[PDB]
């Protein structure tokens, strides 16, 4: 049995230390790390019985008292955002390689926005839709988007959009509703947004 923090945040290019707690493991027990990207099946990352075990992407560290381990990602990128699982399997006896995945830790990797340009835009309505769409975009990664206080207003959580052609990343969230009182000016009122956010007029 192992435990890990529920989630962790990191910025692109920064190294990341993902901790794991466990009962004292013998010098013959191995620690395994797997990860799972969005809508994909899990994938092996690394495993070992000592520290200084590594590969391109990461390294494994095991505390001196063997009561905790750490997966170290040397240089996190957006693609490293995923759920990371620390697994402590059985070794010897009647063991066959069974792996017990716990809840893992959710790693979110935020882009480094060089020139924040927060703004809320209204997109052109669609003929076949009765919904009005508002786009909150280009804000710094520290900004959080909250859910609306209305059941008739849908707001997505923030996501990163990467325009690789121009080496340009941006954060954004969308809000939509068919209500009459719905306007982009108030769409994100339940969120703490930059005071200098641009609202076209």
């Amino acid at each position: 049995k192992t435990t890990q923090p529920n989630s962790m945040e990191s910025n692109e290019e920064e190294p990341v230390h993902l901790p794991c707690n466990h009962s004292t493991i013998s010098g013959t027990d191995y620690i395994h790390w797997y990860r799972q990207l969005p809508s994909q099946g899990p994938e092996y990352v690394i495993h070992g019985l000592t520290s200084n075990v590594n590969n391109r992407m990461a390294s494994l560290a095991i505390a001196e008292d063997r009561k905790s381990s750490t997966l170290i990602l040397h240089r996190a990128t957006l693609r490293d955002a995923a759920v990371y699982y620390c697994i402590l399997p059985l070794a010897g006896g009647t063991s066959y390689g069974k792996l017990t995945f716990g809840q893992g830790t959710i790693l979110t990797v935020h882009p480094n926005i060089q020139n924040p340009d927060p703004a809320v835009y209204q997109l052109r309505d669609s003929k076949s839709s009765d919904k009005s769409v508002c786009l909150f975009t280009d804000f710094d990664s520290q900004t959080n988007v909250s859910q609306s206080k209305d059941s008739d207003v849908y707001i997505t959580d923030k996501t990163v959009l990467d325009m690789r052609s121009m080496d340009f990343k941006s954060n954004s969230a969308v809000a939509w509703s068919n209500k009459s009182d719905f306007a982009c000016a108030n769409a994100f009122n339940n969120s703490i947004i930059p005071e200098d956010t641009f609202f076209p007029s």
Binding site: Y34, P38, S39, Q40, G41, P42, E43, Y44, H47, V83, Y85, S95, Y96, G97, K98, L99, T100, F101, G102, Q103, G104, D117, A119, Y121, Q122, L123, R124, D125, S126, S128, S129, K131, V133, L135, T137, D138, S151, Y154, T156, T159, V160, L161, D162, M163, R164, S165, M166, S170, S172, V174, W176, F198, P200
Partner: protein
């Protein structure tokens, strides 16, 4: 690598289903897992060649697995219940000293009645003229709504070619009616391009939503069109303005 089929499956409560796994050739070990939403994979059963040495994870007798020739394995679930809704994962490894390779998974949704199944309606929202003037960029938004189950794959196509750069799609479909257990879903996606690219009337943009629903083997007695696997798209052409 490891393959699984079907990739998506919607079943009526009480019906039986069979999930297939085609592991990597020569891999002696095969593992099955059940992964509920927001949870980690839970072990179901293990095979060493054709021998199912550890099946301590099977929930009940409704679950049965086989791997007759030590290669392909089938996980069968009889009299499916709503609680069976999950992504079933299969993995294989050469042996205990080696790592596990996972399949893409089979997403199973068990519903009370197939009349709950609906394909998505899709709409594209053209860029804000203000964004174009302010940033020299143009963001299009695609909204897929009213579908059930949440078995969809959204993609963008520009001038007949799929694009990956500049696209950001929500990780998971949102419930339109959180209180209802059979609530339909909505999903959004964004495609951002340069203002000059959007201003070219020759550029054609299409948001495509692949929906996985009923098959020919599923009965349908409703008045509306059978909600079979299909794609639903919405389009927009560049605009000079």
């Amino acid at each position: 690598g490891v393959s699984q089929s079907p990739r998506y499956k919607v079943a009526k409560r009480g019906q039986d289903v069979a999930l297939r796994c085609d592991p990597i050739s020569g891999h002696v070990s095969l593992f099955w897992y059940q992964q509920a939403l927001g949870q980690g994979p839970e072990f179901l059963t293990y095979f060493q060649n054709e021998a199912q040495l550890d099946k301590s994870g099977l929930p009940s007798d409704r679950f049965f697995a086989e791997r007759p020739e030590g290669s392909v394995s089938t996980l069968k679930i009889q009299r499916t219940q709503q609680e069976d809704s999950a992504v079933y994962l299969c993995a294989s490894s050469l042996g205990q000293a080696y790592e596990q390779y996972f399949g893409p998974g089979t997403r199973l949704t068990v519903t009370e009645d197939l009349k709950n199944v609906f394909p998505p309606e899709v709409a594209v929202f053209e860029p804000s003229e203000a964004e174009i003037s302010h940033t020299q960029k143009a963001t299009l938004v695609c909204l897929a709504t009213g579908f059930y189950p949440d078995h969809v794959e959204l993609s963008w196509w520009v001038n007949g070619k799929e694009v990956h750069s500049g696209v950001s799609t929500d990780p998971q479909p949102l419930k339109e009616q959180p209180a209802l257990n059979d609530s339909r879903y909505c999903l959004s996606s964004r495609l951002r391009v340069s203002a000059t690219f959007w201003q070219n009337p020759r550029n054609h943009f299409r948001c495509q939503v692949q929906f996985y629903g009923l098959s020919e083997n599923d009965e349908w007695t409703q008045d509306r069109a059978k909600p079979v696997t299909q794609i639903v798209s919405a389009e927009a052409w560049g605009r000079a303005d």
